[PDB]
Amino acid sequence: NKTISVTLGLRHWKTVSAAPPEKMSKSGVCKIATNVYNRDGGANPFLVKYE
Amino acid sequence: NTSDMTNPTPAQGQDGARTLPSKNLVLPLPFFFSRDCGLALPTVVLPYNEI
Known part of the structure; x- marks a missing residue:
């Protein structure tokens, strides 16, 4: 018969494990680089006992 | 129970023209971790x- 147009078999739709297992509301990391504004040094504590 | 909220107020044309203040209140939720x-x-x- 007449020519039929090709039907592109595009599927993709692999989705993504976007939903965490339960909620996986846990990505724990700690401050490491001694914060910023590293502040002063020993600030001469010394002792005050009356020698 | 502040007596500024629980005290009856008459209409505008009566002796009591006071209005109930629009203040904010705090309620602590008693839970097992808060016990x-x-x-x-x-x-x-x-x-x-x-x-």
Whole structure:
């Protein structure tokens, strides 16, 4: 018969494990680089006992 | 129970023209983790829960 147009078999739709297992509301990391504004040094504590 | 909210106020044309203040109130929620400091939620140990 007449020519039929090709039907592109595009599927993709692999989705993504976007939903965490339960909620996986846990990505724990700690401050490491001694914060910023590293502040002063020993600030001469010394002792005050009356020698 | 401040007596600024629970005291009856008459209409505009009567002796009592006072209005109830639009202040803010605080209610602490009594929960098992709020009963005692020794009972606290281990959020670090609960990464697979959605509280």
